[PDB]
DNA sequence: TTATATTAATATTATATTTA
């Protein structure tokens, strides 16, 4: 249950976000207000606001991650996110409001699905 | 009289208070509810000359009854006491009979269970 | 009452806030799922004429069978003790009422009324009926989720770091929702509304929104009223031939609206000129 | 009487709005079931039609079968009250009544009536015989939760600080209503159902969603009216061989329908100039 | 008379209508239950060919033993006084009285009349035999409320004004009812029912929906018409061995139906050509 | 009487706003409006309209669970649903209409059978 | 009287659709036209028609409701009964048809039979 | 022919997958 060439740029958001909270989320597991619990609100609506700090904001959990190549394995699928998304839009659409939200669980089960992301990054 | 007796027991049916139906309702009349609209062209060979059979020996009340009460019960649209009492005859004898095997006899009054 | 058959686009805009918000919906305004597009109901413009003849009248004639402590049945009983109490004899009792209430109401004048409620007072059909006010383009429901520093109740969490109920204040960024109406003379001669009652409700649309302010619509703009009057108590033209005179579309080069400059309305009053008469009250 | 059998394929749209408010049995856009795809009665456009003829004529010989104060059986008793008083021998004396009825109510000429209640005056079969209207592509009722800021009853249920009552505005956010209607000339000779009452009845049709307006039918428009006048009185080509001219189909990409825009009505008369004539009334 | 014998199947459909109220099931269409499938009684068919000769024959020898003012035996003794008054010895004057309801009424020519009733005109069988037509997958009735905004004897006038009397339409959103139906020769024998009679009854039962429109049945079409033409006035093959050859299937992915594109209609004419003809007049 | 594979949208997005309203309805279990009361009329026509909104609001709803681990129990079956949910459809099928309620019923069962969501996620 | 467990989907929406009623008319007791005087015509017929509403307007009922726990007591039966219901038939069968009456009336009589429900609900 | 006024109504569940 993961378009991963979905394209959609609200689907691919949603991806994206949730591969940003996974990342945080392996930074420090033990977490008060993960990107979700902050960002989310306007991730999902107002990918502009958010997105460029939740990047700024990446590669600090990219070195927080314990096991340095868990990072290469996260960043390497938000690389495959980003492919899909040429800009983050001002407003997501409200279909894209929606499929941001689709990504994000979408996203965040291919995450936690167990050998996934490790599995698809040894195919590339 | 066991024999009509027992005809005008399995034809007891209800009636309210100042209900226009006689107690015990006249063969006549209660053929008058299977007829056409009045009491002559019931047939006279499986009807009015064997209901009066089935009712003065406390024979099984022919299936010409459900077979014409029915037909008025839903010709006239309703169901006359004496087509209700009737019917009431016909079952009672033929679960009395053993041809109608499953159901238990009708009462007079309305069985608020039943279950059929 | 009013002789000519009237057909407005009455575009108005929101600039920052709920248009209208959906019940079904929160408060998220009332959107069209398949477009993306907002609504503002019938009855939220209705009720905005509502509130400014409220506003404005404060007499009798143009009552307005009203807000909160607004027990319907009992405005309609009001009118069952009137002229009326015992000399209208059921069948036309209801329809002395119902004129009472197209009398006293500007409300039931201009809107129906269903008031088969209490002493049933009739069925008014009331001749102005908008139609939903659709926005012309996308709004872009900005889900603004506001802070409060004070919870409401004694809730789970009244605890100690602080009280707060945060909770959301939807707002569209800006819509430029445009609603269609129709006032028919059939149903203003059964209403007995007049058309000192419509210049009522033209003043009612064009000013309404400078009145039924909220923190929860922002500031909301009667930002044009193309009323088409045609000739007859019958339609010149069919009246969605007519709406699409008043056609309203993003300008030139802007991707979204967040103004009405980025709207450019044009009218189309090159034929209808037939026998009708487009006047542009709002713009 | 009129002398061609006309089928005719009308195709009406509601905007945004409860096309006909919907079963009674519920209230959500009458729907098929299975397709999903919204039905309107063919008594509900029989009515937009009796309402509009009600407006437009205010006529002796075109009076209607009113509304609310509409005792059926006082206009059929009233029927009993002319040259057939009694002196028609009430065989005919009811064929008599319902002629005059014919003649009197252009509802009766144009769609029957069941006129054999009071006195009885027959029953009438009503020429003109429209369908129940179901939409081209499935009604997508969009059920708008409104509110009011007014409580119906002084009920327990209307409360200390506020009395408001919800309530719901089901709305069709787009539809395409198609009637095939069937005007049988053999039938309009039992009520003399005249050429003038059926060009009454095509203007019907195409004007009367302009008039009969309301705040729960939204915007609701006569989107075609594509009649086949056959040459005879007898039937030109089998009536559904006619109504798959009509073809209504979604336009090349729009998953939903929004507007008529979103339509392709397309329409052959290729072959129908064999005998039939497809007077392309309403669009 | 005819010196073939027929056995056609006559798939007709109900679009969105009754196409046989039940007067037993209020006026819900005719079902068989127990497998919910429709029934439109082989007397509905009959009628409204009965209906359709009434139309377009308008001529003596083919009267309809007719309309409502019908009384029968009225037309019987109109037999009795003929030709046959005395001449035929009330023996043969029941069968001197069939032969003429026989030349005068194609009702009784072609489907039978039971005339014993007046001065007794015989006993017709009637040569055309059509079946009960039941449809081919259970008819979903959908018993659409509907809504008068009038009522009748002011006895169910409201206690205020406001009169309706709401009612029921039922419709089956689709049914391909299908008529089994046989003409035979024995009885064309008796009747006089002839090749001209018979093609005016093909004619009848392609074009018998056309004309015999309601609001009730909504629209109802002739579906398909396969003649089985035998060769001898006996049947060259059983007839249910022909009627299998017209299988009639609701297609490949169809829930349930809702148009007659949702049936597929395979005639199997492969071999039945052994002496015999199948001319597929309807479909 | 729970179909977690159903794939019908209208039932996804049921069993969806189940448990949204679940989260909800553990984050302060007393509430006046819960998303039953304030979003479903449109949940179950309109999905875009709420869903999108009804994911803003799910993070924070997560964050309120007293029960750290319950987040993430209910989390996963958020995930669970939406990899049956490739859109959040503009306005939901009558057919799926229909299916909106039986999936909130349905999936509002699954989470109060006792066991049900604390065992079928430890079989993930 | 009541077949709890028929899985009749008829008779599972007759029982929903008594349950609905009963909710609506416990919401408010003094009600004009209960769901059985404006839905069940259809709901009894078609399903899909109202059973979607009925369930937009069933959250709003069950906070109506002036015992809290008794909206529990209520929507608890609901779900049990839309466990059996795996879709809102789009037409009821003929059987169905009936089966609804059916179900309206013996869900009617297992409500307003005295502890039925809260007795029911208790050994859940 | 008759008859013709409200049953029932108080909480289900609830503790962490994935991470070379």
């Known amino acids: 249950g993961l378009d991963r060439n979905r394209q959609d740029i609200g689907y691919v958001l949603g991806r994206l976000f949730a591969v940003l909270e996974k990342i945080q989320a392996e930074a420090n597991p033990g977490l008060n207000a993960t990107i979700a619990d902050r960002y989310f609100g306007s991730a999902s609506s107002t990918p502009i606001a958010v997105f460029g700090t939740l990047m700024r904001l990446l590669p600090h959990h990219l070195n927080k991650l314990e096991f340095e190549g868990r990072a290469v394995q996260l960043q390497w699928e938000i690389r495959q996110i980003l492919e899909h998304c040429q800009r983050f839009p001002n407003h997501l659409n409200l279909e894209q409001q929606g499929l941001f939200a689709i990504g994000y669980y979408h996203e965040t089960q291919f995450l936690f699905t167990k050998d996934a992301l490790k599995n698809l990054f040894n195919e590339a | ?116 | ?283």
Chains 1, 6, 7 share one sequence.
């Not at chain 2, 056409?36 to 024979?59: C, F, H, V, W, Y």
């Not at chain 3, 409220?54 to 009137?82: P, S, V």
Request: proline share 4%; hydrophobic share 35%.
């Open chain 2, 1 to 116: 009289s066991e024999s009509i007796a027992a005809w005008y027991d399995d034809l007891q049916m209800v009636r309210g208070e100042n209900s226009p139906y006689p107690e015990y309702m006249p063969l006549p009349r209660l053929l008058g509810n299977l007829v056409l609209d009045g009491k002559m062209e019931n047939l006279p060979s499986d009807l009015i000359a064997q209901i009066t059979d089935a009712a003065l020996n406390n024979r099984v009340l022919p299936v010409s009854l459900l077979q014409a009460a029915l037909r008025r019960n839903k010709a006239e649209q309703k169901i006359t006491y004496g087509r209700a009492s009737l019917l009431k005859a016909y079952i009672n004898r033929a679960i009395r009979a053993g041809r109608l095997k499953n159901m238990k006899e009708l009462t007079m009054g309305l069985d608020r269970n039943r279950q059929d």
């Open chain 3, 1 to 283: 009452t009013i002789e000519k058959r009237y057909d407005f686009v009455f575009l108005f805009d929101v600039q920052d806030g709920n248009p209208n918000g959906d019940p079904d919906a929160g408060n998220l305004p009332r959107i069209d799922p398949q477009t993306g597009e907002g609504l503002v109901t019938d009855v939220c413009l209705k009720r905005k004429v509502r509130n400014f003849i409220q506003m404005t009248q404060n007499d009798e004639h143009h009552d307005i069978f009203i807000r909160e402590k607004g027990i319907l049945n009992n405005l309609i009983d009001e009118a069952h003790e009137q002229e009326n109490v015992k000399g209208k004899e059921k069948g036309e009792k209801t329809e002395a009422a119902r004129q009472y209430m197209c009398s006293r109401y500007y409300d039931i004048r201009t809107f129906g009324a269903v008031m088969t409620t209490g002493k049933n007072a009739g069925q008014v059909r009331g001749p102005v009926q908008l139609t939903f006010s659709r926005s012309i383009d996308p709004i872009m429901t900005l889900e603004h989720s506001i802070t409060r520093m004070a919870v409401t109740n004694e809730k789970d969490a009244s605890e100690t770091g602080d009280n707060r109920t945060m909770g959301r204040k939807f707002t569209v960024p800006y819509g430029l929702y445009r609603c269609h109406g129709f006032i028919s003379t059939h149903f203003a001669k059964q209403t007995g509304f007049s058309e000192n009652d419509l210049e009522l409700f033209w003043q009612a649309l064009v000013n309404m929104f400078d009145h039924d302010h909220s923190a929860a619509r922002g500031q909301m703009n009667a930002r044009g009223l193309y009323v088409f009057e045609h000739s007859n108590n019958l339609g010149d033209a069919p009246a969605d031939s007519l709406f699409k005179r008043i056609q309203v579309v993003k300008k030139d080069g802007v991707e979204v609206v967040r103004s009405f400059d980025d709207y450019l309305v044009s009218v189309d009053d090159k034929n209808l000129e037939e026998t009708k008469l487009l006047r542009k009250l709002g713009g």
